[PDB]
Design a protein around this ligand. Structure first.
Ligand SMILES: *[C@@H]1O[C@H](CO)[C@@H](O[C@@H]2O[C@H](CO)[C@@H](O)[C@H](O)[C@H]2NC(C)=O)[C@H](O)[C@H]1NC(C)=O
Ligand SMILES: *[C@@H]1O[C@H](CO)[C@@H](O[C@@H]2O[C@H](CO)[C@@H](O)[C@H](O)[C@H]2NC(C)=O)[C@H](O)[C@H]1NC(C)=O
Ligand SMILES: *[C@@H]1O[C@H](CO)[C@@H](O[C@@H]2O[C@H](CO)[C@@H](O)[C@H](O)[C@H]2NC(C)=O)[C@H](O)[C@H]1NC(C)=O
Ligand SMILES: *[C@@H]1O[C@H](CO)[C@@H](O[C@@H]2O[C@H](CO)[C@@H](O)[C@H](O)[C@H]2NC(C)=O)[C@H](O)[C@H]1NC(C)=O
Ligand SMILES: *[C@@H]1O[C@H](CO)[C@@H](O)[C@H](O)[C@H]1NC(C)=O
Ligand SMILES: *[C@@H]1O[C@H](CO)[C@@H](O)[C@H](O)[C@H]1NC(C)=O
Ligand SMILES: *[C@@H]1O[C@H](CO)[C@@H](O)[C@H](O)[C@H]1NC(C)=O
Ligand SMILES: *[C@@H]1O[C@H](CO)[C@@H](O)[C@H](O)[C@H]1NC(C)=O
Ligand SMILES: *[C@@H]1O[C@H](CO)[C@@H](O)[C@H](O)[C@H]1NC(C)=O
Ligand SMILES: *[C@@H]1O[C@H](CO)[C@@H](O)[C@H](O)[C@H]1NC(C)=O
Lengths: 231, 346, 364, 49, 98, 49
């Protein structure tokens, strides 16, 4: 029910570091970024039938999630340290017309899934974000800094049909939460033919290029090679 | 490992000599900087951004804010002094007679063309086009900076912080008039217009004077006049072809322009530094903190910006001394080579 | 006055710097109507224990910070980043209130850059904190003669605590090689001790109540803004402006800048705010500085005459803010008081770009 | 020192312009040596007698 | 005879020896040792002392760079004179007096 | 046992770069100039020797 492959990331995972408009400028920033040409992991989750192991992954300072699935097999995420009703556990569920975020201490089984048509210091009910129904690639960045959970989102249609394509796509900031939780492990949710890409962020210095319309169209990772260090 | 040059051995003997039997006429190009950009810095507006609470604390820091302006005024005066010393070396504006037969020598590429809106030569137009002028003077005129995309221009961003550029005293038309007067006087008289009143002489006899100066009898000229004229015309054509082809010959002038732009860009980008304060915005500091804490952070930013301004003025003074040395050299070059024949080697 | 002398020689002198004064003042704040419930934070029946310090989110209301002195007798009002008398002028996005009870000798641990027992195990503040810490003695409300054991604090933890993190776990701390297996004993400590908090204790061991107001700076559209009425919007005029606590002076114009919906401010090369979003109508306003420039004085010697021509550097001659007879437009700018003449002479007083002036004062 | 480096990062481009000035001086020294000594196109060698 | 060249070498050594010996100054701080300051004081007071040391050492470095720029200008003028002497005296015969 | 001043300079971030033209190549330039002057006079300063 789990298959691991490894592939390249190219120049993917660039997000807006702040909510300040900048146009036609080369801006140097330092943040938790996905490194260029990194080693991202492809996961295939296959169930034996369309009815109604240890696949828990480490968090490791931010997670770049990517999906090319047309249908809504991926429904949400579970974050936490132990996840056995001994500490707080962040739970993000994506409904059809809602999104629910909790830190309830109640635990689930070792193989978590969302069935069809199916103490808590923080609660967050809001408008959902999975309208991206070409192959319609969806990218997300989760990070946890100073008790703040930051979720960055982007939905771009692709036409090459070969994994993560070449090019640049900036991720706009979506969700900020003052939950204040220790996170070292996470897992995904399923409703099986799921396939998704996972990468890990590192503290890196980037040089972003803002064009005439204020869009990050190009970037340079300063610690990739001496040419980009010279740049 | 680099190559010093091709190895050669002179075939020396105590009874053997080598004598040339022919010659060639070589016209080379030498580029010398004369002046640079006349910047001016609004000290109070650059430090404080039109803030009364900042300016009252800036008044406690003595006369640095005035002596920097005095030094920049002295630099801006001596730039025009350098340009006047190099170019204004002739008392009267001479001009070429309309008949342009100077013994077969073709001076059409260096004499001015009256069909142009500005009376410059073809080579002068090529030299003007091969250098990309940035911050030429008061070209924006405080009217081109009121836009949105035009406000994103670096000249408007440096203009809104009190860093302006004064125009040169002599325009390019007047500099071209000086070079045209010097060229016409040289062609029609030789060195007599530099020694005193201009004395007319045919260009064949002037070339005979120059060859007798360099140690060659004048019959070599008077029997090789057409060959010498053809060699000079071919060399002039080679210079104009090289100037039309390669744009990397004018390195020094482009370096002067790049340094004058880069110093102002660095001085503008130094305004974003915190210098140990909580923020780099004086309005944000004054809105956030109280009077005493605002005084502390404003004093920190004042000290940092004053140090940055003093660094800029010191760099400009050193560069102005280097430019003045080059301009004195170029004035010596013109006085000893355009107005006469030089015996100094190389 | 510039030359510090009573006699001025002939020439041009960089004397003054003119600037267009602002006309009026504009305030622009979001139209929120609710009042922030600081009474529920301060005037409570009892406060939570420090290892379970209580966090309350305050948003979408008008916050008055001058009312806090009425319903709570405090003296420790240590504010980092923002002065407490300037809290009503500017305004934030979201406020957080962290309430707990701490002993009087540990209030100094509630500060950025401090470590100890509570600052490493119970409540940790970030080093870039922008907020306020309020502490007051509550011995009469939290002191019992038989000992008050309702307030508990962490004493043992495997690692230090990251800022703004709550740890309410009850696992037994293992201080030895043998495993505790959920049973306390030798080298197996319950990590949650309790205070005594007696009224007969000396001061400094007496119980204290602490509310920490954590402030979020202006990056999102603001939801918490205090009492300041918003005036009408004035465009195409040099005015003083206030936008959600950001103060400036300039001209506000309509802009075709394409702000993304998560953006609120737009900045420059020199880190100055030059584009704003209106909090009441979502207009993309552009900020330009008011008309300014340099003023030079062209005069002969005071031994000759006292007549003065004025060169406004850089401006167009239609840009000069009057309230002139002779007005000339040079590449250097606008010349006022010198009559242009068609003749040509030697340069007496240089002006710029081939224009000179000489003594009435003529320009040629 | 990480804390000293983080406090030094707030002071601007002083290090960059100082390094640029020293690099210009270091290039200028080699330019001076080249323009003084390299005035001959071909390396001549003396006859043995 | 070679006192000019010896003075060039001595100036280039002295300008670095002074820069090394300037690291022992306190500039009003409690100590000139950065690790001693970081081990003794906490975050805010250590930041104050480190800011004082940073300002003093940056001013010393700027003074050294300015003096090196002036010395480089003087050496460049001397090199231009030496190049002119090489071009005129060695490669030809000079009629200029002295 | 005795620390060097150059080691103290190098331990604090101050470094001396080597010149581009080495002394043997400078001596080769001066040898070429001397041989050209002796075997040709000034004629190697205006063209071929
Ligand atoms: C990404 O990482 C994985 C493992 O972390 C790499 O897989 C290894 O590949 C080498 C050579 O193909 C094998 O010898 C190892 O046994 C593999 N490791 C595992 C755990 O299977 C993979 O090659 C990396 N990707 C790239 C592009 O280098
Ligand atoms: C958050 O939880 C993790 C557990 O996943 C803690 O990491 C453990 O720390 C102890 C001591 O520091 C180590 O002995 C364990 O090996 C760690 N476990 C793992 C999986 O790394 C961590 O200390 C907690 N706190 C923070 C602030 O991250
Ligand atoms: C001296 O050199 C010139 C050129 O440098 C010679 O002129 C050329 O002579 C050839 C002979 O057939 C002609 O084809 C070329 O057209 C001439 N060139 C020019 C520019 O006129 C000249 O012949 C040489 N004189 C001697 C005596 O050898
Ligand atoms: C002097 O030089 C000019 C420019 O090189 C010559 O003019 C050229 O003549 C040729 C021959 O007809 C034309 O093809 C070119 O178009 C002309 N160029 C220009 C710019 O006019 C001119 O012939 C030369 N000789 C004289 C006596 O003037
Ligand atoms: C999820 O959506 C279904 C139908 O769209 C609805 O009946 C249900 O109440 C929703 N759940 C939540 C928590 O909003
Ligand atoms: C809420 O958490 C506390 C933690 O002490 C626990 O004792 C209690 O049972 C929880 N309530 C539930 C699970 O309903
Ligand atoms: C900016 O947007 C406009 C309108 O959408 C478009 O015409 C223009 O090409 C864009 N700029 C760039 C650099 O693509
Ligand atoms: C706190 O609230 C109670 C009732 O809500 C009231 O009786 C009491 O006076 C309040 N305390 C203060 C200090 O205002
Ligand atoms: C109040 O604010 C909203 C959104 O900013 C705006 O649509 C509305 O017109 C405002 N009301 C008034 C009376 O200005
Ligand atoms: C001044 O204004 C006029 C009309 O307003 C305009 O045509 C001109 O370009 C401007 N600038 C100068 C330097 O005259």
């Amino acid at each position: 029910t789990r298959t691991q492959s490894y592939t390249n990331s190219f120049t993917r995972g660039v997000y807006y570091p702040d909510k300040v408009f900048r146009s036609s400028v080369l801006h140097s920033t330092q943040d938790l970024f996905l490194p260029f040409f990194s080693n991202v992991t492809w996961f295939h989750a296959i169930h034996v039938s369309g009815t109604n192991d240890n696949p828990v992954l480490p968090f490791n300072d931010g997670v770049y999630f990517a999906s090319t699935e047309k249908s809504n097999i991926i429904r949400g995420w579970i974050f936490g340290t132990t996840l056995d009703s001994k500490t707080q556990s962040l739970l993000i569920v994506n409904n059809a017309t809602n999104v629910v975020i909790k830190v309830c201490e109640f635990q689930f089984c070792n193989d978590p899934f969302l069935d069809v048509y199916y103490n808590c210091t923080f609660e967050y009910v809001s408008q959902p974000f999975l309208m991206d129904l070409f192959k319609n690639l969806r990218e997300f960045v989760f990070k946890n800094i100073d008790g703040y959970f930051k979720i960055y989102s982007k939905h771009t249609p692709i036409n090459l049909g070969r994994d993560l394509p070449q090019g640049f796509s900036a991720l706009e900031p979506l969700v900020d939460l003052p939950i204040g939780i220790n996170i070292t492990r996470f897992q995904t949710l399923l409703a099986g033919a799921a396939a998704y890409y996972v990468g890990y962020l590192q503290p890196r210095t980037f040089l972003l290029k803002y064009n005439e319309n204020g869009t990050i169209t190009d970037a340079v990772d300063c610690a990739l090679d001496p040419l980009s260090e010279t740049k | 490992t680099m190559s010093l040059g091709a190895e050669n051995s002179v075939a020396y003997s105590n009874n053997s000599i080598a004598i040339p039997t022919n010659f060639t006429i070589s016209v080379t190009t030498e580029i010398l900087p004369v002046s640079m950009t006349k910047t001016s810095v609004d000290c109070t507006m650059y430090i404080c951004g039109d803030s009364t609470e900042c300016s009252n604390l800036l008044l406690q820091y003595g006369s640095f804010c005035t002596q920097l302006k005095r030094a920049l005024t002295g630099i801006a005066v001596e730039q025009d002094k350098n340009t006047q010393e190099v170019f204004a070396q002739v008392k009267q504006i001479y001009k070429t007679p309309p008949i342009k037969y100077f013994g077969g020598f073709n001076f059409s590429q260096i004499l001015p063309d009256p069909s142009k809106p500005s009376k410059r030569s073809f080579i002068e137009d090529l030299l003007f086009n091969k250098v990309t002028l940035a911050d030429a003077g008061f070209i924006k005129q405080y009217g081109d900076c009121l836009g949105d995309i035009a406000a994103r221009d670096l000249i408007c961003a440096q203009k809104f912080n009190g860093l302006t550029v004064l125009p040169p005293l002599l325009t390019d038309e007047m500099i071209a008039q000086y070079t045209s007067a010097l060229l016409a006087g040289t062609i029609t008289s030789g060195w007599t217009f530099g020694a005193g009143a201009a004395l007319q002489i045919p260009f064949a006899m002037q070339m005979a004077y120059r060859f007798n100066g360099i140690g060659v009898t004048q019959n070599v000229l008077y029997e090789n006049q057409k060959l010498i004229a053809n060699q000079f015309n071919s060399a002039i054509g080679k210079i104009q072809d090289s100037l039309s082809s390669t744009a990397s010959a004018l390195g020094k002038l482009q370096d002067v322009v790049n340094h004058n732009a880069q110093a102002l860009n660095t001085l503008v980008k130094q305004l974003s530094s915190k210098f140990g304060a909580i923020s780099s915005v004086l309005n944000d500091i004054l809105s956030r903190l109280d009077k005493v804490e605002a005084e502390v952070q404003i004093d920190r930013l004042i000290t940092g910006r004053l140090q940055s301004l003093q660094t800029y003025v010191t760099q400009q003074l050193i560069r102005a001394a280097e430019i003045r040395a080059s301009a004195n050299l170029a004035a010596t070059k013109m006085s000893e080579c355009v107005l006469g024949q030089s015996k100094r080697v190389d | 006055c510039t030359l510090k002398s009573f006699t001025v020689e002939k020439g041009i002198y960089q004397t003054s710097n003119f600037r267009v004064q602002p006309t009026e003042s504009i305030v622009r704040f979001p139209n929120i109507t609710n009042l922030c419930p600081f009474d529920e934070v301060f005037n409570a029946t009892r406060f939570a224990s420090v290892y379970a310090w209580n966090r309350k989110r305050i948003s979408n209301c008008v916050a008055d910070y001058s009312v806090l002195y009425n319903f709570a007798p405090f003296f420790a009002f240590k504010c980092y980043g923002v002065s407490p008398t300037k809290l009503n002028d500017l305004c934030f996005t979201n406020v957080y209130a962290d309430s707990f009870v701490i002993r009087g000798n540990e209030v100094s641990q509630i500060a950025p850059g401090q470590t100890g027992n509570i600052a490493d195990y119970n409540y940790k503040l970030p080093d870039d904190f922008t907020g306020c810490v309020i502490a007051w003695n509550s011995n009469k409300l939290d002191s019992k003669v038989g000992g008050n054991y309702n307030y508990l604090y962490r004493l043992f933890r495997k690692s230090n605590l990251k800022p703004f993190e709550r740890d309410i776990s009850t696992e037994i701390y293992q201080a030895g090689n043998k495993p505790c297996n959920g049973v306390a004993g030798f080298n197996c400590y319950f990590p949650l001790r309790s205070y005594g908090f007696r009224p007969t204790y000396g001061v400094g061991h007496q119980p204290y109540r602490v509310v920490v107001l954590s402030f979020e700076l202006l990056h999102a559209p603001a939801t918490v803004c205090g009492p300041k009425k918003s005036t009408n919007l004035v465009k195409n005029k040099c005015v003083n402006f206030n936008f959600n606590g950001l103060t400036g002076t300039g001209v506000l114009t309509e802009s075709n800048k394409k702000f993304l919906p998560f953006q609120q401010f737009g900045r420059d090369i020199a880190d100055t705010t030059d584009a704003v979003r209106d909090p009441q109508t979502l207009e993309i306003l552009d900020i330009t500085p008011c008309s300014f420039g340099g003023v030079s004085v062209i005069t002969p010697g005071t031994n000759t005459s006292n007549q003065v021509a004025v060169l406004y550097q850089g401006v167009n001659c239609t840009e000069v803010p009057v309230a002139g007879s002779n007005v000339f437009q040079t590449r250097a700018g606008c010349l006022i008081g010198a009559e242009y003449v068609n003749n040509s002479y030697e340069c007496d007083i240089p002006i710029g770009a081939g224009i000179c002036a000489s003594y009435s004062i003529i320009a040629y």
